[PDB]
Amino acid sequence: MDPMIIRGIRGARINNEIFNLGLKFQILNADVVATKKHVLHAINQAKTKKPIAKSFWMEILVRASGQRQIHEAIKIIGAKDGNVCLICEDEETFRKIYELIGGEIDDSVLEINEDKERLIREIFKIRGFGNVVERVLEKIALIEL
RNA sequence: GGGCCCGUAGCUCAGUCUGGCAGAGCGCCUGGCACCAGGUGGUCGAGGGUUCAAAUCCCUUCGGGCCCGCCA
């Protein structure tokens, strides 16, 4: 319907309130997202693949974690008081939550550096050589296995 | 993370509950006139345990498939 809007924001203090407002959005840990392609592929899996979660936006989070467990996904790639990736379909929705966490918007916060690569490879159990994001998508694609 | 089913002849699978000679159909070989008769079939996924006796029960494990919970 609406085009997905994805923008990372640097230095955000997360308030658990935002999850009790019934707003169509998803917020991730920017420091563990391979790139904008990571989130896009997760949304693709959420849109198409067989549901694991009772919500589409929750389905994004679990697909981003590369595994079925819902609570593990919240820990693996859930937003943690800092660099985050806000995901919306309504501009007003994005504006609302940003007012509740703050932080200068910086899409580079979703770009990957060597320290982020070590973190992602350790987190996503990426044991081996090969382009990090390529095998991040590969791990997400086979959640249905 | 939790729960369930399959694995047995070359193939499809019964048999497992309730331990008691390893079975059917299918094909395969032979002979006879597609059909008839004779013949042919086993690392029971693996290991270990229990037992006089295990495909069968217990533990463990490999391979294939299915379901579920977690919903900041």
CSV table of C-alpha atoms (C1' of nucleotides) in Angstrom, one decimal:
chain,number,residue,atom,x,y,z
A,1,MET,CA,0.0,0.0,0.0
A,2,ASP,CA,2.2,2.8,1.3
A,3,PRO,CA,5.9,2.8,0.5
A,4,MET,CA,8.0,1.6,3.5
A,5,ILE,CA,10.0,4.5,5.0
A,6,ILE,CA,13.3,3.4,6.7
A,7,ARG,CA,15.6,5.8,8.3
A,8,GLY,CA,18.1,5.1,11.1
A,9,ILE,CA,18.4,7.6,13.9
A,10,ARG,CA,21.6,8.0,16.0
A,11,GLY,CA,21.5,8.4,19.8
A,12,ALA,CA,17.9,7.5,20.7
A,13,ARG,CA,16.6,6.9,24.2
A,14,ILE,CA,13.8,4.3,23.9
A,15,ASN,CA,10.7,4.5,26.0
A,16,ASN,CA,8.7,1.3,26.4
A,17,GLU,CA,5.6,3.5,26.1
A,18,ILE,CA,5.9,3.6,22.3
A,19,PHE,CA,5.0,-0.1,22.2
A,20,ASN,CA,1.8,0.5,24.1
A,21,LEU,CA,0.3,3.1,21.7
A,22,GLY,CA,-1.0,0.7,19.0
A,23,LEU,CA,1.0,2.3,16.2
A,24,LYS,CA,2.0,0.6,13.0
A,25,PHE,CA,5.8,0.7,13.2
A,26,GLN,CA,8.9,-1.4,13.9
A,27,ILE,CA,12.1,-0.2,15.5
A,28,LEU,CA,15.4,-2.1,15.4
A,29,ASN,CA,18.9,-2.0,16.7
A,30,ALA,CA,20.8,-0.1,14.1
A,31,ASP,CA,24.1,-1.5,15.3
A,32,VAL,CA,23.2,-5.0,14.2
A,33,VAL,CA,21.5,-4.3,10.8
A,34,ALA,CA,23.7,-5.4,7.9
A,35,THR,CA,22.4,-2.5,5.8
A,36,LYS,CA,19.1,-1.2,4.4
A,37,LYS,CA,19.0,-4.5,2.4
A,38,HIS,CA,18.8,-6.5,5.7
A,39,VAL,CA,15.6,-4.7,6.7
A,40,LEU,CA,14.2,-4.8,3.2
A,41,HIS,CA,14.7,-8.6,2.9
A,42,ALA,CA,13.0,-9.1,6.3
A,43,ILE,CA,10.0,-7.0,5.2
A,44,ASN,CA,9.9,-9.1,2.0
A,45,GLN,CA,9.8,-12.3,4.1
A,46,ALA,CA,7.2,-10.8,6.4
A,47,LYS,CA,5.0,-9.6,3.5
A,48,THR,CA,5.2,-13.0,1.7
A,49,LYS,CA,6.4,-15.9,3.7
A,50,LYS,CA,4.2,-17.8,6.1
A,51,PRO,CA,3.5,-15.9,9.3
A,52,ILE,CA,5.2,-16.6,12.6
A,53,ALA,CA,3.9,-13.6,14.4
A,54,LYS,CA,0.3,-12.4,14.9
A,55,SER,CA,1.4,-9.0,13.5
A,56,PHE,CA,3.0,-8.0,10.2
A,57,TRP,CA,5.3,-5.5,12.0
A,58,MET,CA,6.3,-8.1,14.6
A,59,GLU,CA,6.9,-10.5,11.7
A,60,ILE,CA,9.5,-8.0,10.4
A,61,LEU,CA,11.4,-8.2,13.7
A,62,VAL,CA,11.5,-12.0,13.8
A,63,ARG,CA,12.6,-12.2,10.1
A,64,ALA,CA,15.3,-9.7,10.8
A,65,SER,CA,16.6,-11.9,13.6
A,66,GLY,CA,17.0,-14.9,11.3
A,67,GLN,CA,15.2,-17.3,13.6
A,68,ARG,CA,11.7,-18.3,14.8
A,69,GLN,CA,11.9,-17.4,18.5
A,70,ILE,CA,9.9,-14.2,19.0
A,71,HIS,CA,11.6,-13.2,22.4
A,72,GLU,CA,15.1,-14.0,21.1
A,73,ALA,CA,14.4,-11.7,18.1
A,74,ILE,CA,13.4,-8.9,20.4
A,75,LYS,CA,16.8,-9.3,22.1
A,76,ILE,CA,18.8,-9.9,19.0
A,77,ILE,CA,17.7,-6.9,17.0
A,78,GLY,CA,15.4,-5.0,19.3
A,79,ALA,CA,16.1,-1.3,19.8
A,80,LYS,CA,18.5,-0.6,22.8
A,81,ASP,CA,18.7,3.1,24.0
A,82,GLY,CA,20.9,4.4,21.2
A,83,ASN,CA,21.4,3.7,17.5
A,84,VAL,CA,18.1,2.4,16.1
A,85,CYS,CA,16.3,1.9,12.8
A,86,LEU,CA,12.7,3.2,12.7
A,87,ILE,CA,10.5,1.5,10.1
A,88,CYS,CA,7.1,3.0,9.2
A,89,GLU,CA,4.5,3.2,6.4
A,90,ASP,CA,2.9,6.5,7.7
A,91,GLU,CA,5.0,9.6,7.9
A,92,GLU,CA,2.9,10.9,10.8
A,93,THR,CA,3.6,7.6,12.6
A,94,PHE,CA,7.3,8.1,12.2
A,95,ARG,CA,7.1,11.7,13.4
A,96,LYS,CA,5.2,10.5,16.5
A,97,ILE,CA,7.7,8.0,17.8
A,98,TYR,CA,10.7,10.1,16.9
A,99,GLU,CA,9.2,12.7,19.3
A,100,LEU,CA,9.4,10.0,22.0
A,101,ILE,CA,13.0,8.7,21.5
A,102,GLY,CA,14.9,11.7,20.0
A,103,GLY,CA,18.3,11.6,18.4
A,104,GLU,CA,19.6,13.2,15.2
A,105,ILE,CA,18.5,11.1,12.2
A,106,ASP,CA,21.5,9.6,10.5
A,107,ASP,CA,21.0,6.9,7.9
A,108,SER,CA,24.8,6.1,8.1
A,109,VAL,CA,23.9,4.5,11.5
A,110,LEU,CA,22.7,1.6,9.4
A,111,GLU,CA,26.0,1.3,7.4
A,112,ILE,CA,28.4,-1.4,8.6
A,113,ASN,CA,31.9,-1.0,9.9
A,114,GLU,CA,34.5,-3.6,11.1
A,115,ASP,CA,33.2,-3.5,14.7
A,116,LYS,CA,29.6,-3.8,13.5
A,117,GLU,CA,30.7,-6.7,11.2
A,118,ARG,CA,32.3,-8.5,14.2
A,119,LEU,CA,29.1,-7.9,16.2
A,120,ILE,CA,26.8,-9.1,13.5
A,121,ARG,CA,28.9,-12.2,12.6
A,122,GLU,CA,29.0,-13.2,16.3
A,123,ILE,CA,25.3,-12.5,16.8
A,124,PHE,CA,24.1,-14.1,13.6
A,125,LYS,CA,26.3,-17.2,14.2
A,126,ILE,CA,28.1,-16.4,11.0
A,127,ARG,CA,30.9,-18.9,11.3
A,128,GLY,CA,32.9,-18.7,8.1
A,129,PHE,CA,34.2,-16.4,5.4
A,130,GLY,CA,32.0,-14.6,2.9
A,131,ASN,CA,30.4,-11.2,2.5
A,132,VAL,CA,28.7,-10.5,5.8
A,133,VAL,CA,25.4,-9.1,4.5
A,134,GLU,CA,25.1,-11.8,1.8
A,135,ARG,CA,25.1,-14.5,4.5
A,136,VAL,CA,22.9,-12.4,6.7
A,137,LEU,CA,20.2,-12.5,4.1
A,138,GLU,CA,20.9,-16.2,3.5
A,139,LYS,CA,20.3,-16.9,7.2
A,140,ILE,CA,17.0,-15.0,7.1
A,141,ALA,CA,15.8,-16.8,4.0
A,142,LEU,CA,16.1,-20.2,5.6
A,143,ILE,CA,14.1,-19.3,8.8
A,144,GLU,CA,11.5,-21.6,7.3
A,145,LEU,CA,13.7,-24.7,7.8
B,1,G,C1',13.3,-23.3,23.4
B,2,G,C1',8.9,-27.3,23.8
B,3,G,C1',5.7,-31.2,21.4
B,4,C,C1',4.5,-35.1,17.3
B,5,C,C1',5.1,-38.8,12.9
B,6,C,C1',8.2,-41.5,9.4
B,7,G,C1',12.8,-44.7,8.6
B,8,U,C1',11.5,-52.4,7.8
B,9,A,C1',13.3,-56.7,1.0
B,10,G,C1',15.2,-53.2,-5.3
B,11,C,C1',9.9,-49.8,-4.5
B,12,U,C1',5.2,-48.7,-1.6
B,13,C,C1',4.4,-49.9,3.3
B,14,A,C1',2.1,-53.4,7.4
B,15,G,C1',4.3,-55.1,11.9
B,16,U,C1',5.9,-51.5,17.4
B,17,C,C1',0.4,-50.5,21.5
B,18,U,C1',0.3,-56.1,24.3
B,19,G,C1',8.5,-58.4,23.2
B,20,G,C1',7.9,-64.8,20.8
B,21,C,C1',10.7,-68.1,13.5
B,22,A,C1',11.1,-60.8,9.3
B,23,G,C1',5.7,-59.9,6.7
B,24,A,C1',2.4,-58.4,2.4
B,25,G,C1',1.7,-56.0,-2.2
B,26,C,C1',5.0,-54.6,-6.0
B,27,G,C1',8.7,-55.7,-9.0
B,28,C,C1',13.1,-59.1,-10.1
B,29,C,C1',14.8,-64.7,-12.1
B,30,U,C1',13.0,-69.3,-14.3
B,31,G,C1',9.4,-72.1,-16.7
B,32,G,C1',4.6,-72.5,-19.1
B,33,C,C1',0.5,-70.7,-22.3
B,34,A,C1',-1.2,-60.3,-21.1
B,35,C,C1',-2.3,-64.4,-18.0
B,36,C,C1',-0.9,-69.4,-15.1
B,37,A,C1',2.7,-72.2,-11.9
B,38,G,C1',7.4,-72.5,-9.3
B,39,G,C1',11.5,-69.5,-7.5
B,40,U,C1',13.5,-64.6,-5.6
B,41,G,C1',13.7,-61.4,-1.7
B,42,G,C1',16.4,-58.0,5.1
B,43,U,C1',22.8,-54.1,8.3
B,44,C,C1',14.5,-53.7,10.6
B,45,G,C1',18.6,-45.9,10.0
B,46,A,C1',23.0,-46.4,13.9
B,47,G,C1',24.9,-47.4,19.1
B,48,G,C1',24.0,-49.1,23.9
B,49,G,C1',20.8,-51.0,27.6
B,50,U,C1',16.7,-54.4,29.7
B,51,U,C1',15.5,-59.8,28.6
B,52,C,C1',15.9,-66.8,28.2
B,53,A,C1',14.2,-63.9,23.7
B,54,A,C1',13.9,-56.8,21.0
B,55,A,C1',11.9,-54.2,14.3
B,56,U,C1',8.7,-54.0,19.0
B,57,C,C1',10.4,-51.7,25.5
B,58,C,C1',14.2,-47.8,28.0
B,59,C,C1',18.5,-44.3,27.2
B,60,U,C1',21.3,-42.1,23.4
B,61,U,C1',22.1,-40.6,18.4
B,62,C,C1',21.9,-39.7,12.7
B,63,G,C1',18.5,-38.7,8.5
B,64,G,C1',13.4,-36.8,6.6
B,65,G,C1',8.7,-34.4,7.5
B,66,C,C1',5.0,-31.7,10.6
B,67,C,C1',3.1,-28.8,14.9
B,68,C,C1',3.6,-25.2,18.8
B,69,G,C1',4.8,-21.5,22.2
B,70,C,C1',6.7,-17.1,23.4
B,71,C,C1',3.8,-11.0,20.2
B,72,A,C1',9.1,-5.0,24.1
